[PDB]
Write an enzyme that holds these catalytic residues in place. Sequence first.
Site, short mmCIF file in Angstrom:
data_model
loop_
_atom_site.label_atom_id
_atom_site.label_comp_id
_atom_site.label_asym_id
_atom_site.label_seq_id
_atom_site.Cartn_x
_atom_site.Cartn_y
_atom_site.Cartn_z
N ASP A 66 0.82 -1.22 0.00
CA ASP A 66 0.00 0.00 0.00
C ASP A 66 0.85 1.27 0.00
O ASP A 66 0.47 2.29 0.59
CB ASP A 66 -1.01 0.00 1.16
CG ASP A 66 -2.25 0.86 0.88
OD1 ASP A 66 -2.51 1.20 -0.30
OD2 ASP A 66 -2.97 1.19 1.84
N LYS B 207 2.08 4.60 -1.29
CA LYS B 207 1.59 5.74 -2.07
C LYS B 207 1.85 7.01 -1.24
O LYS B 207 1.98 6.91 -0.01
CB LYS B 207 0.11 5.58 -2.47
CG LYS B 207 -0.88 5.37 -1.32
CD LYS B 207 -2.28 5.16 -1.86
CE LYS B 207 -3.32 5.15 -0.76
NZ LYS B 207 -4.69 4.95 -1.32
N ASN C 12 0.01 7.68 2.15
CA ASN C 12 0.30 6.82 3.31
C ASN C 12 1.62 7.14 4.02
O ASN C 12 2.00 6.45 4.99
CB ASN C 12 0.24 5.34 2.90
CG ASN C 12 -1.18 4.84 2.71
OD1 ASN C 12 -2.14 5.41 3.24
ND2 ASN C 12 -1.32 3.76 1.95
N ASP D 292 -1.17 3.17 7.76
CA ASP D 292 -2.09 2.36 6.96
C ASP D 292 -1.49 1.00 6.63
O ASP D 292 -0.84 0.81 5.59
CB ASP D 292 -2.56 3.12 5.69
CG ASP D 292 -3.83 2.53 5.07
OD1 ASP D 292 -4.15 1.34 5.30
OD2 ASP D 292 -4.50 3.27 4.31
N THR E 174 -3.65 1.25 -4.74
CA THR E 174 -4.03 2.27 -5.73
C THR E 174 -3.43 1.92 -7.11
O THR E 174 -2.27 1.49 -7.18
CB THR E 174 -3.69 3.71 -5.25
OG1 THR E 174 -4.54 4.65 -5.91
CG2 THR E 174 -2.21 4.09 -5.47
#
Length: 330
Positions: free
Chosen positions: A153, A155, A158, A171, A188
Amino acid sequence: SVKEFLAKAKEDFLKKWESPAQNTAHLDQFERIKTLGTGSFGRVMLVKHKETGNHYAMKILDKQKVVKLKQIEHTLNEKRILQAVNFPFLVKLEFSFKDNSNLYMVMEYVPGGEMFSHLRRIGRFSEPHARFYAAQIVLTFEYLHSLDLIYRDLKPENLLIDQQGYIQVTDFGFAKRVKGRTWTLCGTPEYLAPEIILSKGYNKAVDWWALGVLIYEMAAGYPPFFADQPIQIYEKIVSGKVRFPSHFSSDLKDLLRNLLQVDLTKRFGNLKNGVNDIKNHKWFATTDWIAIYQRKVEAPFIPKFNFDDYEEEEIRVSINEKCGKEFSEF
Ligand SMILES: c1nc(N2CCNCC2)c2cc[nH]c2n1
């Protein structure tokens, strides 16, 4: 020494992983200040722990809604990962507790906001500045992968920036302890490795691809693969063509070509040499890895003593216990 540190860190992790932390603290021990973010089945609030005066970010999850959206095990696994990990660039879980209505996760407050917001405000970073942030992610993934955890995750949203200008990773919503392969299409679109999009299984190598995307975005001021439709993004990702801005150094382009390697078996971070292919790359030549870990390097950006505004709501707690047995292990 790195091997010795990681061996000790693995022992530390597994002890907590096999024997989770006892429930600590109660709601009235925290002064509620402001909502920092909202979601479908919860919210994050800036709180002050009354007795110490310390500021924390408290995640409040509605139990009935967690159960409704079939997110029980997801919530428990995420908590279990957070309470067991310990690294400078990962947010500290300070307290966890529950009442009749809610689950509470009290985490370290990271005051400087998201890297997304920092990018939105200042534009592209110089290569030395991109390298500062990149170095912290490299060490974070080194740590996480040594514990068989895939993050999946990464990105800008985060990555939160602390008072020292260092990254705090939040996250753990998609984090998974896995030996071998998994298949779930999560994360994403812009940051997905080809092997996540394609029907084949994937491993920890997806985090290194995501690192490639992040370095590109930091240095360019935009992602390497973007389009209005996710399918079009996927088509570009799998195709194996990236256009580098003319200002990108030769060292940066070579590192990015090796991180954004479509063949997962040929990707930097996933070879026999492991993380050392990244750490020893010419682009990282000036990086003092020990100094980064110890946070002794002056950051490019120190936040002013950052977050988007949200409408306020009081914590309503029912007089009747909801979903009691469902969250017994929380
Ligand atoms: C280089 N050095 C490291 N240190 C800092 C100095 N004391 C030993 C552990 C670490 C930790 C994770 N990755 C690293 N890479």
